[PDB]
């Protein structure tokens, strides 16, 4: 829906441009400024909602504990689950940040500045990262005490 | 409503002069003769009326639409160029007698 809204906005802008009006580029620039501020506001709202969901649809990440040659093993281990969580929150960010810019390079092709356009500061991103690290830390803490049982085989009768 | 002294633009043409011209036109066929100076003045006013009324309606319309523009300040920057040519035309025309 963001993409169609932006497409209609750009279509209206192009309709103005083809009419050969006066003093367009700065008007387009300030429209981009306002729309990027609004995008930053919506992005902070969505990011904080995603963070509180962690603490917005979220994929369920799963990994198993197995044993091979009588060695406790993880499939996948915890760090890969961390990477999947990071990828999911990257995709959640890209839901908004992949939106194209408005114009009469890569950054100029589609808008990537909403992080600096953050009205509340990096705290929301910081608290999201803090939630991720807390979750992974608790997971590995549970694993450590649970994985400790593997030392029994190491130790013959 | 505003403390400042507004320099409202008008047209140097009394709308009631044509009423005198039509009065003279009626009186000629009525058989009453008016002084020749009045005849010349009425004829000049009648022949110059369409230009004056066109001028006043055009300036009134331009004013109305420019106050509509400034009512929405988000549009004045785009509309500035057209207002610039309009102001240039007004500047050219004002110096004329």
């Amino acid at each position: 829906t963001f993409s169609e809204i932006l497409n209609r906005v750009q279509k209206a802008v192009d309709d103005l441009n083809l009419h050969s009006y006066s003093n367009l580029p700065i008007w387009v620039n300030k429209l981009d400024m306002e729309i990027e501020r609004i995008l930053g506001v919506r992005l902070q709202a969505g990011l904080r909602a995603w963070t509180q969901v962690l603490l917005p649809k979220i994929k369920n990440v799963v990994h198993e504990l197995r044993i091979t040659n009588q060695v406790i093993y993880l499939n996948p281990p915890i760090e890969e689950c961390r990477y999947k969580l990071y990828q999911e929150m990257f995709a959640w960010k890209m839901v908004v940040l992949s939106l194209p810019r408005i114009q009469s390079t890569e950054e100029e092709k589609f808008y990537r500045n909403a992080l600096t356009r953050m009205p509340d500061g990096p705290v929301a991103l910081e608290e999201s990262y803090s939630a991720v690290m807390g979750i992974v830390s608790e997971v590995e803490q549970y694993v450590k005490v649970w994985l400790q049982y593997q030392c029994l085989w190491d130790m013959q009768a | 409503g505003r403390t400042g002294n507004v320099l409202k633009l008008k047209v140097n043409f009394l709308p009631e002069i044509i009423t005198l011209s039509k009065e003279v036109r009626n009186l000629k066929w009525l058989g009453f003769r008016v002084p020749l100076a009045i005849v010349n003045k009425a004829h000049q006013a009648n022949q110059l009326y369409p230009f004056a009324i066109s001028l006043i309606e055009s300036v009134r319309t331009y004013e109305r639409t420019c106050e509509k523009v400034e009512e929405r300040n988000t549009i004045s920057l785009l509309v500035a160029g057209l207002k610039k040519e309009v102001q240039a035309l007004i500047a050219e025309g004002i110096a004329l007698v």
């Binding site: 006066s22 | 507004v6 920057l77 500035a80």
Partner: peptide, 28 residues
Amino acid sequence: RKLVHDKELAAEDEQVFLMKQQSLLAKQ
């Protein structure tokens, strides 16, 4: 050396133009 747009269209508020041309009419 990517060219940046120069000075945009100016407003020149109606009141200033009106007073300038009032002065010009007075002096003419």
